Each structure stands twice: as C-alpha cells, then as structure tokens.
From Swiss-Prot, chain A:
Assembly mode: Component of the 19S proteasome regulatory particle complex. The 26S proteasome consists of a 20S core particle (CP) and two 19S regulatory subunits (RP). The regulatory particle is made of a lid composed of 9 subunits, a base containing 6 ATPases including PSMC5 and few additional components. Component of a complex with USP49 and RUVBL1. Interacts with PRPF19. Interacts with TRIM5. Interacts with NDC80. Interacts with PAAF1. Interacts, in vitro, with the thyroid hormone receptor (in a thyroid hormone T3-dependent manner) and with retinoid X receptor (RXR). Interacts with ERCC6.
Whole-protein coverage range: 70 to 128 of 406
Protein name: 26S proteasome regulatory subunit 8
Family: Belongs to the AAA ATPase family.
Residues spanning the membrane: none
Organism expressing this protein natively: Homo sapiens (Human)
Stated role: Component of the 26S proteasome, a multiprotein complex involved in the ATP-dependent degradation of ubiquitinated proteins. This complex plays a key role in the maintenance of protein homeostasis by removing misfolded or damaged proteins, which could impair cellular functions, and by removing proteins whose functions are no longer required. Therefore, the proteasome participates in numerous cellular processes, including cell cycle progression, apoptosis, or DNA damage repair.
Residues modified as Phosphoserine: S51
Compartments where located: Cytoplasm; Nucleus
Chain's gene name: PSMC5
Classification of source organism: Eukaryota, Metazoa, Chordata, Craniata, Vertebrata
From Swiss-Prot, chain B:
Name used for this protein in its record: 26S proteasome non-ATPase regulatory subunit 13
Family label: Belongs to the proteasome subunit S11 family.
Chain positions found as N6-acetyllysine: K15
Organism: Homo sapiens
Residues shown, of full length: 284 to 376 of 376
Biological function: Component of the 26S proteasome, a multiprotein complex involved in the ATP-dependent degradation of ubiquitinated proteins. This complex plays a key role in the maintenance of protein homeostasis by removing misfolded or damaged proteins, which could impair cellular functions, and by removing proteins whose functions are no longer required. Therefore, the proteasome participates in numerous cellular processes, including cell cycle progression, apoptosis, or DNA damage repair.
Oligomer status and interactors: Component of the 19S proteasome regulatory particle complex. The 26S proteasome consists of a 20S core particle (CP) and two 19S regulatory subunits (RP). The regulatory particle is made of a lid composed of 9 subunits including PSMD13, a base containing 6 ATPases and few additional components.
Top-level taxon of origin: Eukaryota
Native organism taxonomy: Eukaryota, Metazoa, Chordata, Craniata, Vertebrata
Curated annotation (Swiss-Prot), chain C:
Modified positions (N6-acetyllysine) in chain numbering: K159
Name listed for the protein in its UniProt record: 26S proteasome non-ATPase regulatory subunit 1
Function in brief: Component of the 26S proteasome, a multiprotein complex involved in the ATP-dependent degradation of ubiquitinated proteins. This complex plays a key role in the maintenance of protein homeostasis by removing misfolded or damaged proteins, which could impair cellular functions, and by removing proteins whose functions are no longer required. Therefore, the proteasome participates in numerous cellular processes, including cell cycle progression, apoptosis, or DNA damage repair.
Assembly mode: Component of the 19S proteasome regulatory particle complex. The 26S proteasome consists of a 20S core particle (CP) and two 19S regulatory subunits (RP). The regulatory particle is made of a lid composed of 9 subunits, a base containing 6 ATPases and few additional components including PSMD1. Interacts with ADRM1. Interacts with ZFAND1.
Shown part of the complete sequence: 562 to 748 of 953
Domain of life according to the entry: Eukaryota
Residue windows of the PC repeats: 20-55, 56-88, 90-124, 125-165, 168-187
Family recorded in the similarity comment: Belongs to the proteasome subunit S1 family.
Curated annotation (Swiss-Prot), chain E:
Organism of origin: Homo sapiens
Distribution of this protein across tissues and organs: Widely expressed. Highest levels in heart and skeletal muscle.
A GO BP entry: regulation of proteasomal protein catabolic process
Gene name in the database record: PSMD14
Role description: Component of the 26S proteasome, a multiprotein complex involved in the ATP-dependent degradation of ubiquitinated proteins. This complex plays a key role in the maintenance of protein homeostasis by removing misfolded or damaged proteins, which could impair cellular functions, and by removing proteins whose functions are no longer required. Therefore, the proteasome participates in numerous cellular processes, including cell cycle progression, apoptosis, or DNA damage repair.
EC numbers on record: 3.4.19.-
Modified residues (Phosphothreonine): T185
Protein name as catalogued: 26S proteasome non-ATPase regulatory subunit 14
Interval of the full protein contained in this chain: 82 to 310 of 310
Lineage: Eukaryota, Metazoa, Chordata, Craniata, Vertebrata
Length: 59, 93, 187, 191, 229, 286
C-alpha cells in the first residue's frame, strides 16, 4: 500500500515538508505531474510510502 | 459357471453330496463357517446364490476363458474409447 | 515445394526456428497466393504461449497480403489492441508493411490509440508504423497534422519518455526526411 | 615420481589360519600391505590404494585414496568367510580403475591368493587375454598350496604378460617359516 | 555472507569432488538471499563481490527472496557491478536495447533506481529442452492425474449421489437466493434504465453454477461406460 | 510398515541432470543416484538427492561399482548444510530390474537403514507414472521357496512443497490448473479409456505371452486372486441398479431444469438490450 501524507506547511524550494505518522516529517519533492501550489497546506493528501510522491488532495 | 445365472440350487449340491435337504442348511452354514465363501442367499424358496471363493489350484479352461473374457473386455473398452473419442476429439479436443 | 518443409519445421520444439518457419513461409507465399498459411500464422499467433512467434507472426501475413491495402487493417483491427504487448507491436509492424507506400487511412485512424499506451513497444512501433505511411503525402489531400505534431512532440517529449521509445521516434522522423522527399519505397 | 594406482585383492577364506604356515599369516600379509603402502607413500605419497577381498560378494572396503591411515583400520574386521572368487575379483578392480581421480595414475593391480583357483584354463585365457587387452600391470602373488603352485598358472602368467621389457612380474612363494614380506620385497614391485 | 564465510579448501574440495564426477565447470558467480529488506546488495556484498570479480570478469550476483515474493510470481533478478572509472563516460554501453523494456519490470520506486547508481542489473532468460519439457510436463499432469487414472472417477460419479446432491441443493439455494433479488429487478428496469449502479452481475456466477451442475451430466456417461464394461 | 511415499519433482529433475551430465559416451546405463529423504514420519518424503559414478560390466551383471567415501563426503557436506534430511534409499533410472539390484541394494540396506528402490524411465514416453516405490523387504513364501529380498510396490504420489510449484508453473505457462467445468473434466473423459486401455493392453498381451511361454514362478498364486477379483464382476444384470439409473437420471432431470431455467434467465438482459440499445441509438442517430 501507500501512506497518508498531511502537509502542514508548503516550502518555497519545491521541497514540501509533510507531516507524516510518527518518525516521519519527511520533506520531499512530490511527483512532477502534480504542481506544488495546488497542494494546500493544513490538508490531508495521498502519499506513496517510499517514493513520497503525492497523488491527490483529500477531505 | 462364471456368468449366465450365477444363482444355483440345493439339488445339485445334495446330488453332489448324496445328502438330504434337511442337512444342506447345516452344510452351507458350515461352508460359511469355514470362511472360504461369503455368499448369502436371499431366497425364500430354496436357492443357492454364491459370491467369492478362491480358485487356488489351476484350470486351463479358465486360463483360456480368462484370455477370452479378458481380450473381450479389452476390445470392448478399446471400442468404446474409439467410439466416444472419434466424434469427441473432433468437437471438443 | 516447401510446404512439407515448413509444416515439418512448424512442429519444431525450437521457438526461434518456429518463427523462422513463418519468416521463411512469407517469401515462398508472397502475392496472396495462399489462403492456407494465414490459418496457421494466425493460429500460432493466438495459440502459442511464446510471444516470439506471436510478434513474428503477422508480418508474413502482410508479405502475402500486400496486394490489397483494404483487406489488411480490418483483420488486424482486433490485433491493434491485443492481449500482450507483442502482438500489438507485431500488429504495428503489419500495419507498417501492408499500408506502406499507400494512402489508406484505415491504418492511420488506428494509430491514435497506438500512439498512447503504457508500453514503450507499441509507442515505438506506433511511430515506426506511422513513419511508413505518411511518406509522399500532401496535407491538402488528407488530414495528417495530428500525426505530424505527435511525431514532432516526442523529440521535445524525449525528457519524459522512454529511451528506446525516443530511438524509434527520431529514427521514425528520419523516414519522412528520407532523401529530401524525393525517394520513396514501393512494395 | 611414480604416478599409479594400487589395487589389492585379499584372501578371507579359512585357509589363512592353517597351523602349518605362519600364525594367521593374514596378519603377515596385512603388514606386507602396511610396508608396501608406506613404501609407496615414501616413493610417491599421492598414490591411491583401494581395498577389496576375493569372496563371493566382494566389497570395496576402502575407495582409492592416498590416505592409508583409515585403510589401517579397514584392514581389520576381515570377516573370515567364503572360499574364493577369481573372475569377478579381477573384474571388480580392473574396470573399477576407471573411476579414479588422477587419470595420469597408471594401472597396477596385485592380488593375494590363498586358495586354489576354481576357474578352468578356459576362463584363465579369457581373463589373461582380457587383461593383456586393456594393458594393466598385474602382479600375481600366490600364498599357500594344496596342489602344485603354478602348473596352468605359469602359462596363465605368460599369456597374461605382454611387453617383455619391464612388464609384469610373477610372485611364487615357496613354503617357509620366513615371512611373506621380505620375500615379496625381493622383486622390483617393492621399490 | 562474507569473504571469510567462503572456506576455500572446502570450496575447492567440493569443486574437485564435482570434477571427479561429470562436472568440469568453473564457478560463474555467487548468489545469496536478502530477505525482507529488498534485493539490493550491502557494502559487505559489494566488497566481497569486488573481491570475487577479480578472477571472473562477468561475476554474476543473484538474490532470491521468496519471503516477500508471492507464490503467484517468482521474480528473481541477477545484479551487476559497474566500474568506478566508467563514471566519466556514459554508464552502461550495452548494445541491443530491445530487452530493456523487459528489464524495467524491476521498477520498485526505492530500490532499483533508488540504488541503481554504481550498481546495475542484467536480463534473465531460460532454456527448456524436450526431455525437461515432456518429463516435467507429464510429471506435472501426472502430478494432477491419478495412477491408473480411472480410480477417482466413479468416486465423484457416486459422490454425485452421496455428497454433491447436497451441493446441488445448496446450489439451488444460491440460485433461488439470487432469484429473490432478481424478483425486484424488473421494477428497477421498469423505471430507470439509464446508468448501472450495482457491481453485482447475477449472471456469470449462475453460469458457473450450471458448469458445476454439468458434472452430473458429464459423469453420468462415465457411469454408462463403467456399467457397459 | 510404510504405506506411501512422497517424491518431489526436484530429484527427477536431477534425473534430467543425470541425462545432462553424461557427456555422450555411448553407455547410458541405469545411473544410480543416492536418494535422500525423510524416513522420519511413517510417510516417506523425498526432498533432494545426488548421484555417484556407477559402472557395471557389459556381460556380467554382478559386477557393480559404488563408493563409500563419496557417500560419506557428499552426504557429510549435505548434512553439514542441511541435517534435517538423512539417507533413505536409492534408485536406478533403467526400465529393468536386474539380478544384481539385490546386491547393489544390499550395500544401502547395510550402511543406510531399510532402503527404498525407485524404478524410473530413461525416456519419459510412458503415459503412466514414472516413479514406483519398491520396498526392500524379505517375505516368507507359501510354496516353501527360500526367503529372499522382495520388491513390493509401495504406492507413490508426486508432490511439490511450495516454491517448486511456483518455479515449475512459471517455467511451463502451458499447463492449465484444476479448472473444473467443461475442459479439464472432459479431457480426462476423452483420454481416460485410452489410459486404462494402454495399461491393460500393455499388460495382458505380454502377460498372455508369459502364460504359454513362461515358467520360473511368475507368482502363479497371485493369478488365482487376480482372476478371482476379475471374476468378481460377472457382467451385472442391472436389475436392482435400474432404480439407480432412475436416481442418476432424475438428478439428470434436475440438471435439465436448472440448465433450461437458468439459461432462460440469462436470456433476459440479452432479449431486452438487443432492442432497447439498437433502436434508441438508431432513433437518436438521426
């Protein structure tokens, strides 16, 4: 499977800090087919568990 | 008799044994008491139906009849296998 | 002559030589003189488990059926999107060879599903098959701008596409450029 | 040095404990095995020695190996049964030479014969022709007698022996309270 | 796994015992298992690889890992070491780039390209001759067939009379238990007819129920053959 | 004592290796491999094996060549890597049981325990099962003939543990699985009479040859139980079994009503959609 990312803050260097499940907080560039600015902070997203690329915004 | 009315009667037994019909129930009870035969006869009117016994000695007529019914069974199973299989392989494969 | 030879070598245990019966049985049978070999070419195309004879299959079918441009892509139409990628790719070879030198749009209208797939094989031979038809063709006769621009978008899309896909892309782009439009091919 | 394989065929009949000759000369020829295997070890330590009897059911007691240390152990538990078997005693070694590791190791087979031979001259010439065919150095060592030692065994050797220059040697031991050891050390086969 | 784990006199001892048998082959590589943490190769692995590639220039390294590999696929890969002085030039000057479309099957998004620098791989194909093919084939068909093969036939022909009748009644219970659902369906089809909302199909299951029900028909003729001769 | 054995296909694939590592000499004898397995449970379970250089003579059967040191070294290193399996028995790949095989067997009856023998085939053209487990036991005979080592067949099954299934199934891609329904049932129902046909025809013809042209105790006694059990089916009169055919025929009638009714239910979506899709796409086409 894949994990559940939650961005709390977007970083301007296109390397988004994302709050992860404990021992997480993995700052990463998400996948190239998805822009960074669409990913709004303080919202939950869909993240792969190793490659740390975002799939979609979640409610 | 291998087939064709395997069922028999007490008259050939008592004629073989020069014994009365009062004693043939004792005779078949003894024959079942040895245990070489398992045959149990469901008759009301007196009959002798049989099952398994062991040949144990030799019979050349049952060697030849063995080859006869054996070969017959072989060509019947071959005949049905070719018979089903000819149209069967062509429609199913 | 070689009918017992190739039918004898078609029951080979060797998959390479099983392909070679088909590659061989092309040039004996070219000109669509045989409605026989199409049976076992397609039968080894669907039946066999190894995809070497299956992508190796339908090129001999184009090599016999090069006489009619019309009758080919209707019967490679299911093979355009096949089960495996390899019959897709060999189908791209078949539409490549049967429609080469022609103007038949019945291979051309099938390229728009061929140009977009997760497999780089069908993306590559989609451009190879696309390269073999558009040669010696004017736009005012036939609407080719779509395959022009998708043929052009790969050498800028070479950053995000596969390394073997771009090889057949620009290699396919030399085919229109061949001889400065002056020379062509004919079957 | 000398690159060759050594095969010994040993008597296990009850004819080897007879109170005329040496006190269980089975032990004496066992020590002859010890001095020839240690002498071959001193000449070329890589020579491999296999061990088998002349019984009805012959058994490879030790596969051919230069390690004779456990061959010393396998020379015991001799199982003194049976009388003799000549033909498959030959065939059980001469064709078993082809399993050897070092293929440059030449072919040498001896045999310790403590019983009269049960095979006729017709089998003696088939086997002597058989071994002269495949060209194996064969040294025949014959312990004890009831009849004369070599009457047909002589022509069995001469028809067995080809290659008159430095070929095989025959060992015929007389009666004597002297050992078998130095007496079979008298030819060049020990050396 | 270590270069110290390789006992060279035990290695060459077993090798020479293979040489006195019918095996005059040199080593072509060394393999191991990497369970759990993925098929890639540690520093110990790459260093004893670095030592064991001095003799053989090819020096194949293979990792079997059935622990997280499912029983559906037996995906195994043979791995390679690049030379460190080839970093200035292009990485792998391998011709004939057809099979690399098959070599992008190892596409896990951490290990292969997460660790692919200094560390590449090689394609795997097989070989099967006709003795392996028919020996293994009839071996496996026989592994799914019986001894005299007529043995378990009449067993299920007569379990059609003893056991499968219960499965036939239960089969009719799932059938009728869907028929109470399809009782309600022609009202829905008598109202909307636009779009489909149910992922349940009600058809192909019952086709399968008929296919299992036709075992009675197929084995009735089998009973006819046994009753015949 | 032991009812059945389990032989994994790995060792028979090593018999494919027996026919690989020959090197083309012209010998191709019954090359013996040292069978390994688990005698531990009452069932015998073969895991793996190896082979040993074995030579006989052309003329003499009773000359035979094995090795104890190779057995103890290969078995020693194998027990060093895996001590969960021990020596059990052996096998020759020849089709024929030689006279020598009691003596060749006797070496592994001594040093190993009661060893099992397996006859397999050099060419797998036999439709039957290639592997036959022959227990090496001495049995007392009713005729008074002296007791000898007798090879009674122990029934066998060929099974694979876990990964051998996966690797074999990946190597084939040709075999199909269980797949109940029409095909895998009906193919057994195609060739099945041929499978008892070639068995019986393969047996009774040369058996009938050994009837007239045979002597030397062919187990003449088991012919009496043989023909006896063969005459335990004296072409049944079916009179009681008539109602059994009413029973299977009435179950057949149940399959009739299920097939007719359920297929007729499948006709529904067909004979609705055939009209309502075509005429509406037609009437909104123009």
């Amino acid at each position: 499977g894949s994990y559940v990312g939650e961005v709390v803050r977007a970083m301007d260097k296109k390397k988004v800090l994302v709050k992860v499940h404990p021992e997480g907080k993995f700052v990463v560039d998400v996948d190239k087919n998805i822009d960074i600015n669409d990913v709004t902070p303080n919202c939950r997203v869909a993240l792969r568990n190793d490659s740390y690329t975002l799939h979609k915004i979640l409610p | 008799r291998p087939a064709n009315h395997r069922q028999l009667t007490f008259e050939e037994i008592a004629k073989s044994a020069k014994i009365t019909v009062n004693e043939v129930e004792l005779l078949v009870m003894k024959a079942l008491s040895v245990g070489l035969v398992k045959g149990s006869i469901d008759e009301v009117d007196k009959r002798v139906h049989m099952t398994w016994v062991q040949p144990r000695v030799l019979d050349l007529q049952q060697i030849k009849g063995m080859k006869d019914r054996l070969e017959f069974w072989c060509t019947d199973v071959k005949s049905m296998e070719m018979l089903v299989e000819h149209q069967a392989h062509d429609i199913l494969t | 002559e070689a009918d017992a030879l190739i039918e004898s070598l078609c029951r080979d245990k060797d998959p390479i030589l099983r392909r070679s019966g088909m590659y061989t049985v092309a040039m004996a049978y070219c000109g669509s003189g045989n409605n026989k070999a199409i049976r076992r070419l397609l039968h080894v195309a669907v039946s066999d488990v190894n995809d070497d004879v299956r992508r190796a299959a339908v090129e001999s079918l184009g090599f016999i059926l090069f006489r009619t441009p019309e009758q080919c892509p209707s019967v490679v139409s299911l093979l355009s999107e096949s089960y495996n990628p390899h019959v897709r790719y060999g189908a791209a070879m078949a539409l490549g060879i049967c429609c080469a030198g022609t103007g038949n749009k019945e291979a051309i209208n099938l390229l728009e599903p061929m140009t977009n797939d997760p497999v780089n094989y069908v993306r590559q031979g989609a451009l190879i098959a696309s390269a073999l038809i558009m040669i010696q063709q004017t736009e005012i006769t036939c609407p080719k701008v779509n395959q022009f621009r998708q043929l052009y978008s790969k050498v800028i899309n070479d950053k995000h596409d596969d390394v073997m896909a771009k090889f057949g892309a620009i290699l396919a782009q030399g085919i229109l450029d061949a001889g400065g439009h002056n020379v062509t091919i004919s079957l | 040095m000398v690159l060759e394989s050594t095969m010994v065929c040993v008597d296990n009949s009850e004819y080897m404990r007879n109170g005329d000759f040496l006190p269980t000369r089975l032990q004496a020829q066992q020590d002859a095995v010890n001095i020839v295997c240690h002498s071959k070890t001193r000449s070329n330590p890589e020579n491999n020695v296999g061990l088998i009897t002349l019984a009805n059911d012959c058994e490879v007691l030790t596969t051919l190996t230069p390690d004779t240390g456990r061959i010393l152990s396998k020379l015991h538990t001799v199982q003194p049964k049976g009388k003799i078997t000549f033909c498959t005693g030959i065939r059980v070694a001469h064709l078993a030479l082809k399993h050897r590791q070092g293929k440059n190791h030449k072919m040498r087979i001896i045999a310790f014969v403590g019983s009269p031979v049960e095979d006729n001259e017709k089998d003696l010439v088939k086997l002597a022709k058989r071994l002269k065919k495949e060209k194996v150095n064969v040294d025949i060592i014959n312990f004890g007698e009831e009849e004369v030692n070599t009457e047909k065994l002589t022509a069995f050797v001469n028809t067995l022996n080809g290659k008159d220059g430095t070929g095989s040697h025959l060992v015929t031991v007389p009666p004597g309270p002297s050992l078998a050891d130095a007496l079979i050390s008298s030819p060049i086969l020990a050396g | 796994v270590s270069v110290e784990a390789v006992d060279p006199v035990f290695q060459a001892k077993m090798l020479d015992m293979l040489k006195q048998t019918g095996r005059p082959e040199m080593v072509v590589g060394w393999y191991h298992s990497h369970p759990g943490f993925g098929c890639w190769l540690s520093g110990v692995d790459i260093n004893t690889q670095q030592s064991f590639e001095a003799l053989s220039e090819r020096a194949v390294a293979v990792v079997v890992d059935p622990i997280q590999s499912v029983k559906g696929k037996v995906v195994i890969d043979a791995f390679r070491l690049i030379n460190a002085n080839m970093m200035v030039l292009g990485h792998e000057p391998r011709q004939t780039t057809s099979n690399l479309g098959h070599l992008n099957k190892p596409s896990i998004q951490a290990l292969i390209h997460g660790l692919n620098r200094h560390y590449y791989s090689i394609t795997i194909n097989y070989r099967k001759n006709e003795l392996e093919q028919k020996m293994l084939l009839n071996l496996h068909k026989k592994s799914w067939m019986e001894g005299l093969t007529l043995q378990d036939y009449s067993e299920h022909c007569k379990h059609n009379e003893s056991v499968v009748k219960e499965m036939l009644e239960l089969a009719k219970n799932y059938n009728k238990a869907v028929e109470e659902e399809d009782k309600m369906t022609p009202e829905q089809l008598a109202i909307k007819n636009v779009g489909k909302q149910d992922p349940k199909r009600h058809l192909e299951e019952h086709v399968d129920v008929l296919m299992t029900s036709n075992i009675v028909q197929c084995l009735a003729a089998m009973l006819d053959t046994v009753v015949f001769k | 004592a032991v009812q059945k054995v389990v032989v994994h296909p790995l060792v028979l694939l090593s018999v494919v290796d027996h026919f690989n590592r020959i090197g083309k000499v012209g010998n191709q004898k019954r090359v013996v491999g040292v069978l390994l397995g688990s005698w531990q449970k009452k069932v015998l379970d073969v895991s793996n094996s190896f082979a040993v250089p074995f030579d006989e003579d052309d003329k003499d059967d009773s000359v035979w060549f094995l090795d104890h040191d190779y057995l103890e070294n290969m078995y020693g290193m194998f027990k060093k890597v895996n001590a969960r399996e021990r020596i059990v028995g052996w096998y020759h790949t020849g089709p024929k049981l030689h006279k020598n095989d009691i003596a060749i067997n006797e070496l592994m009856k001594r040093y190993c325990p009661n060893s099992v023998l397996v006859i397999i085939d050099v060419k797998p053209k036999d439709l039957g099962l290639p592997t036959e487990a022959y227990i090496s036991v001495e049995e007392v005979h009713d005729d008074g003939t002296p007791t000898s080592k007798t090879f009674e067949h122990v029934t066998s099954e060929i099974g694979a543990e876990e990964a051998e299934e996966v690797g074999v199934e990946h190597l084939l891609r040709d075999i199909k699985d269980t797949t109940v329904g029409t095909l895998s049932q009906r193919i057994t129902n195609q060739v099945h009479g041929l499978k008892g046909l070639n068995s019986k025809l393969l047996d009774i013809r040369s058996y009938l040859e050994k009837v007239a042209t045979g002597k030397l105790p062919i187990n003449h006694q088991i012919i009496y139980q043989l023909q006896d059990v063969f005459n335990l089916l004296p072409d049944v009169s079916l009179q009681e079994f008539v109602k059994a055919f009413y029973l299977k025929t009435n179950d057949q009638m149940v399959v009739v009503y299920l097939a007719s009714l359920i297929r007729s239910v499948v006709a529904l979506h067909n004979l609705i959609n055939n009209k309502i899709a075509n005429r509406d796409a037609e009437k909104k086409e123009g």
